[PDB]
């Protein structure tokens, strides 16, 4: 995607990391960077310094493939949105004055999903199309953009922490095998209805947090941050407890 070519795109960094970068850059009015949304699929976040405070905007990908902040006009790309807001404030806290660029040789951050994504597309096309050699390579190239959203919404099935439809009791048994590492975790399906449980090891005891799909199709622990995908939810709670008794550490391997 074209936002990797932007010098001020930091990839999958957290809000806190974005704020750390803005302070490193002087926290000057209209200093800004771009990052990948950690809870909106296909989305970005704009992080802007003004009045020595950080202001964070989600840039959502619309159904039609344009990009908009809530209450804003649509743009062809995050780059076009940033260029636009360098000319007109149009409800933003201030004008975008100066990009904060990644220091040279520092790459955009990728999560586990981002690192696996090409292999998941390849495996899916091999399995559905049953092609080999150049014919397989062409089918991959042709279908990649059509398949991105399908692979993003089903990629959790192929991730080491996802154990599918197992009981509460089975999930306790699997987590309590081996080293009782704090933060050891898995996710299980409850309903095959968009209902799941996060099973987390805390001081030798297995805690169960419910995950539900709301009417928008967003996943959350009740009163928690909302995500489009389970892999987003795991990446989030692997960085910060954010209301869990502790941060997620080692995935419980399937047995």
């Amino acid at each position: 995607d074209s936002a990797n070519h932007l010098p001020f795109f930091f990839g999958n960094i957290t809000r806190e990391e974005a704020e750390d970068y803005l302070v490193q850059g002087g926290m000057s009015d209209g200093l800004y960077l771009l990052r990948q949304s950690r809870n909106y699929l296909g989305g970005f976040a704009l992080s802007v310094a003004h009045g020595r405070k950080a202001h964070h905007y989600t840039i959502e990908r619309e159904l039609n493939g344009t990009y908009a902040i809530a209450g804003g006009r649509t743009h062809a790309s995050p780059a076009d949105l940033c260029h636009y807001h360098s000319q007109e404030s149009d409800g933003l806290v201030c004008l975008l004055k100066k990009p904060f660029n990644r220091p040279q040789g520092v790459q955009p951050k990728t999560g586990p999903f981002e690192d696996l994504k090409e292999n998941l597309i390849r495996e899916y096309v091999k399995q559905t199309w049953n092609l080999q050699g150049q014919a397989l390579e062409q089918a991959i190239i042709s279908q990649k953009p059509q398949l991105e959203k399908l692979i993003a919404t089903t990629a959790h099935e192929k991730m080491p922490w996802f154990h599918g439809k197992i009981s509460r009791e089975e999930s306790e048994q699997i987590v309590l095998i081996g080293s009782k590492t704090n933060g050891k975790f898995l996710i299980r399906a409850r309903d095959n209805n968009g209902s799941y449980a996060l099973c987390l090891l805390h001081e030798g005891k297995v805690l169960h947090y419910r995950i539900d799909k709301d009417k928008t199709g967003k996943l959350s622990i009740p009163e928690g941050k909302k995500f489009d995908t389970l892999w987003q939810l795991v990446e989030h709670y692997s960085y910060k407890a954010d209301g869990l008794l502790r941060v997620l550490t080692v995935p419980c391997q399937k047995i």
Binding site: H56, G71, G91, H208, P222, E223, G224, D242
Partner: peptide, 17 residues
């Protein structure tokens, strides 16, 4: 028994509304 979050999500995003 399900455990609940020890805090509601409290970070705001700004909008252009």
């Amino acid at each position: 028994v399900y455990t609940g979050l020890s805090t509601r999500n409290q970070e705001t995003y700004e909008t252009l509304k």
